[PDB]
PDB file of C-alpha atoms in Angstrom:
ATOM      1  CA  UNK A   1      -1.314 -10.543  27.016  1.00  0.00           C
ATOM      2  CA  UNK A   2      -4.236  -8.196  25.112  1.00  0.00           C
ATOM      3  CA  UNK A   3      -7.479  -6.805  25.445  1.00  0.00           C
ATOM      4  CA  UNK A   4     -10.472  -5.223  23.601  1.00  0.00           C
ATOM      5  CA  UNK A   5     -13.373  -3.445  23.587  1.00  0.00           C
ATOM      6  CA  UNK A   6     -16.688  -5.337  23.385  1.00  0.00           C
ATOM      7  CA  UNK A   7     -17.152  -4.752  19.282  1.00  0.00           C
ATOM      8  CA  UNK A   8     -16.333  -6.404  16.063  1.00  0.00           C
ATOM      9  CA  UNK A   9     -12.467  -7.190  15.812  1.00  0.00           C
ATOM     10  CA  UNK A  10      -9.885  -7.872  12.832  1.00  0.00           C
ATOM     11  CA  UNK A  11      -6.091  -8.332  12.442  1.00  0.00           C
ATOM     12  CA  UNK A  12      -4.701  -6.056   9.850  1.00  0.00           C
ATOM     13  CA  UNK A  13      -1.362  -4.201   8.968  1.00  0.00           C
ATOM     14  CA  UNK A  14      -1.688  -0.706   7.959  1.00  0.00           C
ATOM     15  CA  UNK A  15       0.575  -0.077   5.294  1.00  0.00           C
ATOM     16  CA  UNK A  16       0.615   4.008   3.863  1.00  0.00           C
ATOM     17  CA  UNK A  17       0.872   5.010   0.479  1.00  0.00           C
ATOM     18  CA  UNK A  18       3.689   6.471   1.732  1.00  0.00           C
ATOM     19  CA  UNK A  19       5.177   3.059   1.756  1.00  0.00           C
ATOM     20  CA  UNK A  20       5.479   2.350   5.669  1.00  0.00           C
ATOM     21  CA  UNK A  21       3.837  -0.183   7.906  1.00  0.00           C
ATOM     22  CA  UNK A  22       1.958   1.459  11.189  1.00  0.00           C
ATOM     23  CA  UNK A  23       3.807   0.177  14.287  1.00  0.00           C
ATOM     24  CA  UNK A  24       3.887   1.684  18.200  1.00  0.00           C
ATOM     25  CA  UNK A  25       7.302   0.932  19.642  1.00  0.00           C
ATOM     26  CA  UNK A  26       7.460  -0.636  23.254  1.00  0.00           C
ATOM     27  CA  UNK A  27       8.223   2.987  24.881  1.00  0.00           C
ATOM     28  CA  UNK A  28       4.696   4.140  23.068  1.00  0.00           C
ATOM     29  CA  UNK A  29       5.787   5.961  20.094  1.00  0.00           C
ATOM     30  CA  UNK A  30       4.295   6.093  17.031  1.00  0.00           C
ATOM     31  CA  UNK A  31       6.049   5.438  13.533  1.00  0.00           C
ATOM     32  CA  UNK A  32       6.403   3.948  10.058  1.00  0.00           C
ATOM     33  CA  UNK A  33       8.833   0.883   9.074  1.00  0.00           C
ATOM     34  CA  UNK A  34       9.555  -0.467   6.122  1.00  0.00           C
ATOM     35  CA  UNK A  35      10.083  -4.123   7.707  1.00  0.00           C
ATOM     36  CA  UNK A  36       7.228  -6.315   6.793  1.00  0.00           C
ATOM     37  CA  UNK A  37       7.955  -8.933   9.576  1.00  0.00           C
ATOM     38  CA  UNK A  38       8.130  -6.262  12.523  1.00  0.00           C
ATOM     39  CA  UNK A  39       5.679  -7.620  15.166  1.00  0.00           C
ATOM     40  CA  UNK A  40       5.069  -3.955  16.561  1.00  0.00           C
ATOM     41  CA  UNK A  41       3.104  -3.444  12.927  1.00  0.00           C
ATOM     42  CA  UNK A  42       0.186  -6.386  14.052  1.00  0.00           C
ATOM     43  CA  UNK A  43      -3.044  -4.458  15.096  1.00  0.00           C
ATOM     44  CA  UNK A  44      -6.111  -5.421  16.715  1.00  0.00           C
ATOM     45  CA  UNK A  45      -8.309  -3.036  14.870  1.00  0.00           C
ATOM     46  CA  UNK A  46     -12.275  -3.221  16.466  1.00  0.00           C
ATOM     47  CA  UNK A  47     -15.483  -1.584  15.629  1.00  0.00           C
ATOM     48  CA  UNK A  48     -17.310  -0.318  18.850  1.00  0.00           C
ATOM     49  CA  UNK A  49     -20.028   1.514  16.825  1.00  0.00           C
ATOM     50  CA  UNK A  50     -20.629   2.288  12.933  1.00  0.00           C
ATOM     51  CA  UNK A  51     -17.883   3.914  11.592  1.00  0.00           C
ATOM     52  CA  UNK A  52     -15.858   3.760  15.363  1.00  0.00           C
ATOM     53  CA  UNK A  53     -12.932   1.427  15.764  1.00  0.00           C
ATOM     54  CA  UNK A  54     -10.032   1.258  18.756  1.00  0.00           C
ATOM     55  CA  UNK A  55      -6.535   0.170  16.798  1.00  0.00           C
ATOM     56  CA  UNK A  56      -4.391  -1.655  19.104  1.00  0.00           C
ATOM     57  CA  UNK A  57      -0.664  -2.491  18.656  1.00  0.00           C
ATOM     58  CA  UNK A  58      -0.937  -6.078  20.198  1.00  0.00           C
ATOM     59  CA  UNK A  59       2.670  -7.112  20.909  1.00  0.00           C
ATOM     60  CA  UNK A  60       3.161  -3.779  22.477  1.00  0.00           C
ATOM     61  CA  UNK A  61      -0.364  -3.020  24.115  1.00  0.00           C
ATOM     62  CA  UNK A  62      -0.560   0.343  23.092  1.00  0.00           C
ATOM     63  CA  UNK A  63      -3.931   2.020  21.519  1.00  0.00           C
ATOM     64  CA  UNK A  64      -3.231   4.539  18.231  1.00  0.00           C
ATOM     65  CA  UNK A  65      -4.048   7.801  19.957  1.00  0.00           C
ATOM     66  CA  UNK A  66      -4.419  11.019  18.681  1.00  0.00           C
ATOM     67  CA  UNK A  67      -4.929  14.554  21.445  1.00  0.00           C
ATOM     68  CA  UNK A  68      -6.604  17.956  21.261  1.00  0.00           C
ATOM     69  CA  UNK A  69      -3.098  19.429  19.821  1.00  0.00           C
ATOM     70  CA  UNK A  70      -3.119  17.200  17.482  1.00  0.00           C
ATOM     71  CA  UNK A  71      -0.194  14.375  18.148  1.00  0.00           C
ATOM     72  CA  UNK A  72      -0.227  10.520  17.374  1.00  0.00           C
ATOM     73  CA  UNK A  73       0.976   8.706  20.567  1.00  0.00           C
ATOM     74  CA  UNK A  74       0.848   5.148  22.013  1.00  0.00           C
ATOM     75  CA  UNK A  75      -1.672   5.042  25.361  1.00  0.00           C
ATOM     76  CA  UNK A  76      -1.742   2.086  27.449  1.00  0.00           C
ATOM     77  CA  UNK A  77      -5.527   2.219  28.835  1.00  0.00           C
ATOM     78  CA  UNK A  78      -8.242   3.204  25.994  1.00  0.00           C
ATOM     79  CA  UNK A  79      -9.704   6.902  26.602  1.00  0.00           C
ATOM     80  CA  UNK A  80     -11.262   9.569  24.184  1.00  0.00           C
ATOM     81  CA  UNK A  81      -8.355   9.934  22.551  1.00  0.00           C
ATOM     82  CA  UNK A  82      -8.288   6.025  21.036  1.00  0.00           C
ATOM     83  CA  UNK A  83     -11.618   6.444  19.305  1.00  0.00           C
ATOM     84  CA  UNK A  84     -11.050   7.199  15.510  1.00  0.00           C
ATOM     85  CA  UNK A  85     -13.519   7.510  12.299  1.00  0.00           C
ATOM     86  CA  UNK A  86     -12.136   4.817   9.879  1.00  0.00           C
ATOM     87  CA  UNK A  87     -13.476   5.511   6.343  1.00  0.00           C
ATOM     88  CA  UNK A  88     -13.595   3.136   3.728  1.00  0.00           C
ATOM     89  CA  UNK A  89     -12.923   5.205   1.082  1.00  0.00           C
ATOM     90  CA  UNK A  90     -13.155   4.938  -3.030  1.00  0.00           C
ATOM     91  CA  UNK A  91     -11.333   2.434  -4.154  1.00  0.00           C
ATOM     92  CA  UNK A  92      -9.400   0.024  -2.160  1.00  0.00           C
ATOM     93  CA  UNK A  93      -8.131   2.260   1.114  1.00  0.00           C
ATOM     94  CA  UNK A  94      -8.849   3.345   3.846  1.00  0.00           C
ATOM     95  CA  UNK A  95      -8.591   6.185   6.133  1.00  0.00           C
ATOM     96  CA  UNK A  96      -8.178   7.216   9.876  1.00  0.00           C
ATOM     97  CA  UNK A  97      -9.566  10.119  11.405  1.00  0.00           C
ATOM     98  CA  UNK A  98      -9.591  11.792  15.052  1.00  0.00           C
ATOM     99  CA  UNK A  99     -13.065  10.947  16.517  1.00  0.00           C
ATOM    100  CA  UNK A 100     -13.287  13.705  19.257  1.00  0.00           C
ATOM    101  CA  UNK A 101     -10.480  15.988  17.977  1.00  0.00           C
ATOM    102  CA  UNK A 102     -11.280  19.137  15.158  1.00  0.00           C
ATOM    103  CA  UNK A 103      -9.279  21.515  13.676  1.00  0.00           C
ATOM    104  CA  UNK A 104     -11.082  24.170  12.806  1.00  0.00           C
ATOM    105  CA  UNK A 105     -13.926  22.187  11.556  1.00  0.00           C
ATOM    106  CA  UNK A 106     -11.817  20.086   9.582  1.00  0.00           C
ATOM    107  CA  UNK A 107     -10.835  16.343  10.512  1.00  0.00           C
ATOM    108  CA  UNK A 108      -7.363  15.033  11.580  1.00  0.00           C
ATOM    109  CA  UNK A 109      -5.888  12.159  10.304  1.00  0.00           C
ATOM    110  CA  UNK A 110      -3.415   9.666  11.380  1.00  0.00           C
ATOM    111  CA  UNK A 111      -0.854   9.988   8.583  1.00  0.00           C
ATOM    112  CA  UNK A 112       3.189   9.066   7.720  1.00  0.00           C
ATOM    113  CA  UNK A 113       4.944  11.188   5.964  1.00  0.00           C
ATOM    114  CA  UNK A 114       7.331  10.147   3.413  1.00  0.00           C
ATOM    115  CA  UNK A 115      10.491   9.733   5.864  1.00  0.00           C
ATOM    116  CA  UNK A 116       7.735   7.457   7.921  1.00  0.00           C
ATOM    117  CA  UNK A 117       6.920  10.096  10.314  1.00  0.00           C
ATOM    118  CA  UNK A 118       3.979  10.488  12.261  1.00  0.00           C
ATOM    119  CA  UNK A 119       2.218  14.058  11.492  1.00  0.00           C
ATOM    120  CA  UNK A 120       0.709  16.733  13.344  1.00  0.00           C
ATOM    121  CA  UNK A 121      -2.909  16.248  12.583  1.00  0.00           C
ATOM    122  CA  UNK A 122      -3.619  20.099  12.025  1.00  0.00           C
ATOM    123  CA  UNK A 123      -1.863  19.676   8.496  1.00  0.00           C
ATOM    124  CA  UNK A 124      -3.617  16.790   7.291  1.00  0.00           C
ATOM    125  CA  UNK A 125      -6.018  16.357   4.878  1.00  0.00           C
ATOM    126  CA  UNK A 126      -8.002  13.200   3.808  1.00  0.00           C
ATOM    127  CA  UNK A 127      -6.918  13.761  -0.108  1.00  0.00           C
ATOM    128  CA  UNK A 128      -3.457  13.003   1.585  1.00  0.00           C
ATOM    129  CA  UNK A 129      -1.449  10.192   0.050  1.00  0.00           C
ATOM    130  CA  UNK A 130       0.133  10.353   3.621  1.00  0.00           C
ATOM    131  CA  UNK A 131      -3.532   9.562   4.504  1.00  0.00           C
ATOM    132  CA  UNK A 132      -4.152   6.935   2.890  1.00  0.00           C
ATOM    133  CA  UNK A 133      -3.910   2.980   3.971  1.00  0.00           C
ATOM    134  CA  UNK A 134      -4.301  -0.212   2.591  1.00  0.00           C
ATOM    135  CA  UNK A 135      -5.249  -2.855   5.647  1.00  0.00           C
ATOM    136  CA  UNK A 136      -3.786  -6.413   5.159  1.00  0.00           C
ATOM    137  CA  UNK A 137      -5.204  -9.115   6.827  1.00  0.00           C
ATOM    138  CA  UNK A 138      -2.221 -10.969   9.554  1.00  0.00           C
ATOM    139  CA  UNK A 139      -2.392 -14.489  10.034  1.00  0.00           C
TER     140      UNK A 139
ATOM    141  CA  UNK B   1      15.385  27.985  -4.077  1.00  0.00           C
ATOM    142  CA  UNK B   2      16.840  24.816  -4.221  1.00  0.00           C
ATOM    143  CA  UNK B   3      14.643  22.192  -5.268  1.00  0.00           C
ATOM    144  CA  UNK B   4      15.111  18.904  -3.242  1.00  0.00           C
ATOM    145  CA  UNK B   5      13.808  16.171  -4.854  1.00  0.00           C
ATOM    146  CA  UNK B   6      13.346  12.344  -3.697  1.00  0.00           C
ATOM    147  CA  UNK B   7      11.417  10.079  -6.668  1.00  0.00           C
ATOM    148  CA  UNK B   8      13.794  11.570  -9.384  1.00  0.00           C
ATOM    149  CA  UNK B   9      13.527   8.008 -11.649  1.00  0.00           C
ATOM    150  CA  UNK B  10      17.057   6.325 -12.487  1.00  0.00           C
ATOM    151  CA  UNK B  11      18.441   4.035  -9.467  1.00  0.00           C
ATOM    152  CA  UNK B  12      16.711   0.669  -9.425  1.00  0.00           C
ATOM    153  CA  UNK B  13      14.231  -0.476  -7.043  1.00  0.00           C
ATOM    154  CA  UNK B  14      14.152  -3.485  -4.887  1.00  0.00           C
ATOM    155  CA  UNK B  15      10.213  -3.806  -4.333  1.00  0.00           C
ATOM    156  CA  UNK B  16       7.193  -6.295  -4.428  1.00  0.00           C
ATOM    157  CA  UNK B  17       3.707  -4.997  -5.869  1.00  0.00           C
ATOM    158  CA  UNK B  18       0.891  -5.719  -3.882  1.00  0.00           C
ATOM    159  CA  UNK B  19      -2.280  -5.644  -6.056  1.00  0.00           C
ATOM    160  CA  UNK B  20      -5.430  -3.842  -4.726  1.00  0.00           C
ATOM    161  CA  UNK B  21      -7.192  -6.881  -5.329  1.00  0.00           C
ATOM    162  CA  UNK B  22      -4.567  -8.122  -2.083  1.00  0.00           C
ATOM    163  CA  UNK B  23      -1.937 -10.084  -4.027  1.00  0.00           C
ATOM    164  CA  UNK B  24       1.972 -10.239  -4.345  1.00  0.00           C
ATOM    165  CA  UNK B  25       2.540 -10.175  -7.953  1.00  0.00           C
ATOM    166  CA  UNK B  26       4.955 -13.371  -8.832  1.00  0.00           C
ATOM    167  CA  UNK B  27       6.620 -14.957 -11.776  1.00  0.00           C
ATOM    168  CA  UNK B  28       6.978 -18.764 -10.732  1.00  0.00           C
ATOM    169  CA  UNK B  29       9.897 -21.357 -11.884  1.00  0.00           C
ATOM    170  CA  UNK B  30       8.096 -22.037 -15.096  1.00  0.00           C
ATOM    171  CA  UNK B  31       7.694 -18.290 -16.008  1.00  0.00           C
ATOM    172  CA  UNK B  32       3.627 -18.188 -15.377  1.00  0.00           C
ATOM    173  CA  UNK B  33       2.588 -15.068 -14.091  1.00  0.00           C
ATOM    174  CA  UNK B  34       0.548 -15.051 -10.736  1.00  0.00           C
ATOM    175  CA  UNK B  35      -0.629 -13.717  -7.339  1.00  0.00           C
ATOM    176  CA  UNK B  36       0.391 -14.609  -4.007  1.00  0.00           C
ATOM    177  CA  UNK B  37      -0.953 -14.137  -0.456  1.00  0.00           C
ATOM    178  CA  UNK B  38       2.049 -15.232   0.868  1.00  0.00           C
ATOM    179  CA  UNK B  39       4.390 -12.602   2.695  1.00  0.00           C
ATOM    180  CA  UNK B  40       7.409 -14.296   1.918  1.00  0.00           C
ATOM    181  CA  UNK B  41       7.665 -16.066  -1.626  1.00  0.00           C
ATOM    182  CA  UNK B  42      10.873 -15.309  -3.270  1.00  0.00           C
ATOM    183  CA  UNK B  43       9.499 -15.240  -6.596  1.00  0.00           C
ATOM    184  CA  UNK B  44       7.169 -12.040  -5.794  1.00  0.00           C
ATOM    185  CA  UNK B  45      11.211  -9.997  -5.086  1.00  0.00           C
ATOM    186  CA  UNK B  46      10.966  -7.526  -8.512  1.00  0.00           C
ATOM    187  CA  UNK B  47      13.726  -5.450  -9.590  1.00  0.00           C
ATOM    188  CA  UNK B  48      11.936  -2.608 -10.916  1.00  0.00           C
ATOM    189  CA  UNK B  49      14.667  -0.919 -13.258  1.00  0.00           C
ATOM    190  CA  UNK B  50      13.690   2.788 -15.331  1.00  0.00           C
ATOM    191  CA  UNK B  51      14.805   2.424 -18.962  1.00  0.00           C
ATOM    192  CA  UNK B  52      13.493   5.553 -20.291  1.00  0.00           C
ATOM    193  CA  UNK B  53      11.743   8.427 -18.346  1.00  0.00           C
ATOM    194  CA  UNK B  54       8.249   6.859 -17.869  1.00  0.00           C
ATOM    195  CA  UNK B  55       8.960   3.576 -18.558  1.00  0.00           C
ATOM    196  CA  UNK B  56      10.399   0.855 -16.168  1.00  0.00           C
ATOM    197  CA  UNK B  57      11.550  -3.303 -16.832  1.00  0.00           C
ATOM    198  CA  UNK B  58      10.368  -5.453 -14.128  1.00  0.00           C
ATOM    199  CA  UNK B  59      12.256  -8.541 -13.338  1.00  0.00           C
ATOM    200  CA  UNK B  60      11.656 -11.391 -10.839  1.00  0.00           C
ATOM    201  CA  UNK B  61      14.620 -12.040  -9.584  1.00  0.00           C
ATOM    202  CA  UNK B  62      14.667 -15.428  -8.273  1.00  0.00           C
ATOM    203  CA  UNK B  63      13.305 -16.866 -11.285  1.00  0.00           C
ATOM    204  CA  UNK B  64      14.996 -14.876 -13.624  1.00  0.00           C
ATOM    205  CA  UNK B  65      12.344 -13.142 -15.619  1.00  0.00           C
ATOM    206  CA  UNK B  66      10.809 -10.175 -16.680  1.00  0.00           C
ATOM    207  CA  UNK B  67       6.905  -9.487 -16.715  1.00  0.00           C
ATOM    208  CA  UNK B  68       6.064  -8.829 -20.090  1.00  0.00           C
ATOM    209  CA  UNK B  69       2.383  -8.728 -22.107  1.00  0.00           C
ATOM    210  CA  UNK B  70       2.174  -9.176 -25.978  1.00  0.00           C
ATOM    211  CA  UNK B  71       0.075  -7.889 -28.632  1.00  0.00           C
ATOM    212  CA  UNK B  72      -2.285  -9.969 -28.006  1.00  0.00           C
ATOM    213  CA  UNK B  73      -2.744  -9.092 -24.469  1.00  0.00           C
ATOM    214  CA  UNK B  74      -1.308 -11.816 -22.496  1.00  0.00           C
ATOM    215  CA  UNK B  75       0.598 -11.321 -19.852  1.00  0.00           C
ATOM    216  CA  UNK B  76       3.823 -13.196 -19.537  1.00  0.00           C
ATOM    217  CA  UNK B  77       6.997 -14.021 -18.060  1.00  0.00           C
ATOM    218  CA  UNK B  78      10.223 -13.644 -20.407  1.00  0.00           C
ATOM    219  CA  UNK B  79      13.831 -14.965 -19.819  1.00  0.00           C
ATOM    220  CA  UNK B  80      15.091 -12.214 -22.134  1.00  0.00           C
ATOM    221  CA  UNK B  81      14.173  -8.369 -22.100  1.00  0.00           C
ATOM    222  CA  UNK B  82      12.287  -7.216 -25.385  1.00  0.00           C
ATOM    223  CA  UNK B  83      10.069  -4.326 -25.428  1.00  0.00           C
ATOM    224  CA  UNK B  84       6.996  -6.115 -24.245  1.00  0.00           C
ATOM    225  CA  UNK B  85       8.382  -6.245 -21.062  1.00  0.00           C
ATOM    226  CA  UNK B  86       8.901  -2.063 -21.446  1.00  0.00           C
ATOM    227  CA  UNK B  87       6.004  -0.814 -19.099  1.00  0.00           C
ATOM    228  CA  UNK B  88       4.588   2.556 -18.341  1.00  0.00           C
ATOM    229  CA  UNK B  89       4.362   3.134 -14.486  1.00  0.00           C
ATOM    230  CA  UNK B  90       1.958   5.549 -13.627  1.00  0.00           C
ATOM    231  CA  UNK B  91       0.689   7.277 -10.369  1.00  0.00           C
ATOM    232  CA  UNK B  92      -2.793   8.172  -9.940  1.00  0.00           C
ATOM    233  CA  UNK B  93      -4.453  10.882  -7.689  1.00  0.00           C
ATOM    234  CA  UNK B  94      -5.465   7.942  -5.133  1.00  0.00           C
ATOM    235  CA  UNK B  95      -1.732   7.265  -4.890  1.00  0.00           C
ATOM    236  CA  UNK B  96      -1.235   3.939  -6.529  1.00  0.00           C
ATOM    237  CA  UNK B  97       0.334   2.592  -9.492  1.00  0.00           C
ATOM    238  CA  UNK B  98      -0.623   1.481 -12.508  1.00  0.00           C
ATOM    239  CA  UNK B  99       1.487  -0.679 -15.445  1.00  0.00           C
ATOM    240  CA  UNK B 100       0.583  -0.252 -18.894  1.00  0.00           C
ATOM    241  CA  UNK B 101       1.957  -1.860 -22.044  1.00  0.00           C
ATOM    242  CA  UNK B 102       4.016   0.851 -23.476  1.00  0.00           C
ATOM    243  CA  UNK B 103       3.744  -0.476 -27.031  1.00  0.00           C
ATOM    244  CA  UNK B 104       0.263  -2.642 -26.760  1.00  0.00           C
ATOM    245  CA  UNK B 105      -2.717  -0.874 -26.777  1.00  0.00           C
ATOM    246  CA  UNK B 106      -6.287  -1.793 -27.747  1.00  0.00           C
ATOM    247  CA  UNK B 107      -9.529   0.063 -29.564  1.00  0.00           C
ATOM    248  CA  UNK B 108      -7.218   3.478 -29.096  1.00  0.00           C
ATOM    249  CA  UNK B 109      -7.343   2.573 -25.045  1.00  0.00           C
ATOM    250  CA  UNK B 110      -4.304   1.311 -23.262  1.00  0.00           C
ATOM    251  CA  UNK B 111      -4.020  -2.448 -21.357  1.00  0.00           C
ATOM    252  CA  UNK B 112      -2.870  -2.660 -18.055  1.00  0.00           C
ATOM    253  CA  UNK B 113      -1.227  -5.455 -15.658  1.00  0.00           C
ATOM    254  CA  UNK B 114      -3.616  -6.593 -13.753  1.00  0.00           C
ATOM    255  CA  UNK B 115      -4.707  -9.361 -10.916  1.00  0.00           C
ATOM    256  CA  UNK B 116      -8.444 -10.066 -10.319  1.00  0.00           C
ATOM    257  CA  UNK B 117     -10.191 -11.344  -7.014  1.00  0.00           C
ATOM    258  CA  UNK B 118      -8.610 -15.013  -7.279  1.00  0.00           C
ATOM    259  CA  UNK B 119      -5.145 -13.376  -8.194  1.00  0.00           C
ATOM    260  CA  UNK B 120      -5.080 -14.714 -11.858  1.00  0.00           C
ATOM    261  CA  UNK B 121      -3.424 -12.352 -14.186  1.00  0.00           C
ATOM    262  CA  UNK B 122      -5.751 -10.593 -16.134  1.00  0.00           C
ATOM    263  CA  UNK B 123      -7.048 -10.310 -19.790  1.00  0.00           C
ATOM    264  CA  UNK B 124      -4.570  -7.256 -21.593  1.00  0.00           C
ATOM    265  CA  UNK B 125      -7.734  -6.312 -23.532  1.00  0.00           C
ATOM    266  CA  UNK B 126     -10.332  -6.399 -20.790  1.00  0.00           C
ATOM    267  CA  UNK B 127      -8.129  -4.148 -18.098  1.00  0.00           C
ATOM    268  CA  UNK B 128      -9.108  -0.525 -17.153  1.00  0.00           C
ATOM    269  CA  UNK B 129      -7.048   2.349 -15.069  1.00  0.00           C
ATOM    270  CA  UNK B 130     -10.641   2.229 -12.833  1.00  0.00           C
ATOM    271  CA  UNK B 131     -10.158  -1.636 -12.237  1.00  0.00           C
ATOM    272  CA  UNK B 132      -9.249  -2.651  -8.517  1.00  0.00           C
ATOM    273  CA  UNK B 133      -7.520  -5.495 -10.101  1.00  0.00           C
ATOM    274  CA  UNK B 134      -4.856  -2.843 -11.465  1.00  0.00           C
ATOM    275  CA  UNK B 135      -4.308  -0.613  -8.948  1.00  0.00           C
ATOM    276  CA  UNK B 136      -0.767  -1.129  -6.963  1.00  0.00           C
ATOM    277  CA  UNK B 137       1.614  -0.723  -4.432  1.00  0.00           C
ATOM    278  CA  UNK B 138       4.889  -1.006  -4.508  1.00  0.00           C
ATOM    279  CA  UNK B 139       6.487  -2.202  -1.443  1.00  0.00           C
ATOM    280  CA  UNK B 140      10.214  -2.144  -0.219  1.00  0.00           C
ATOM    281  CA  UNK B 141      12.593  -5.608   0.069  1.00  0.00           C
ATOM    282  CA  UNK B 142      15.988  -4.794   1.968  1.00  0.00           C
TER     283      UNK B 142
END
């Protein structure tokens, strides 16, 4: 049984261009699959203010979380470290950035590497295929 | 050093392309060339196969064909494998694909696959590498 934030919601998949689906595992971590029926990919993504969204992973209640060091994780209860800057980019994509979290005035992202790996937000960069993610709408 | 290297082309691929324009690319029963929204039509299941360096044949495999255009700039499905079902895939900075014809081009410019907003394939002569409608994904089956 889920919540959310008062805001604007939408159901969506987040799918890389690195070719994995977003999911948070029941134990909270973070990773990539390339299973396009795995129920741990459905996310409640909603905006709280312009440019602010909270992405939840609904049939494991975890928020996509991202700390000071720099480290995707799965949080039960919503804090500082659920916020994120989702940019609609260019042409077609989108991309998820660290709301409260710098490094060395440069954003963090949420990205998968190409084994479908979360990464450690210091070495991303938005021009990152890793980056990069096309939302698909769940129903 | 040692390069290690994991997109060398050769070994087929099992995959679905998902349009930017947020369609499963299908060839139906009857051949006919379409998007779907659905998640789970057999007829969007490509075998994407490299026949040169650069080029690839795609082929849906529960239907038995191969997406093709001709010179005239239709796109098409086609029971047997000629060379305008030879396409050149192509990765762009963003980081998705494009198809081209790899012997059809048109005023110099080359003609891409392509699905528009209602997931109807597109015009060969009226595609550009810009278009929304042309941009892909690949995506892996099991």
């Amino acid at each position: 049984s889920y919540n959310h934030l008062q805001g604007d919601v939408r159901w969506r998949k987040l799918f890389s261009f690195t070719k994995y689906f977003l999911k948070i595992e029941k134990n909270g971590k973070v990773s990539g699959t390339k299973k396009e029926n795995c129920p741990y990919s459905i996310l409640e993504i909603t905006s709280v203010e312009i440019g602010v969204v909270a992405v939840k992973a609904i049939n494991s209640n975890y928020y996509l979380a991202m700390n000071k060091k720099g480290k995707l994780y799965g949080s039960k209860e919503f804090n500082n470290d659920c916020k994120l800057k989702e940019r609609i980019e260019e042409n077609g994509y989108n991309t998820y950035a660290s709301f409260n979290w710098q490094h060395n005035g440069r954003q963090m992202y949420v990205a998968l590497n190409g084994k479908g790996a979360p990464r450690r937000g210091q070495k991303t960069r938005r021009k990152n295929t890793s980056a990069h993610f096309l939302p698909m709408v769940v129903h």
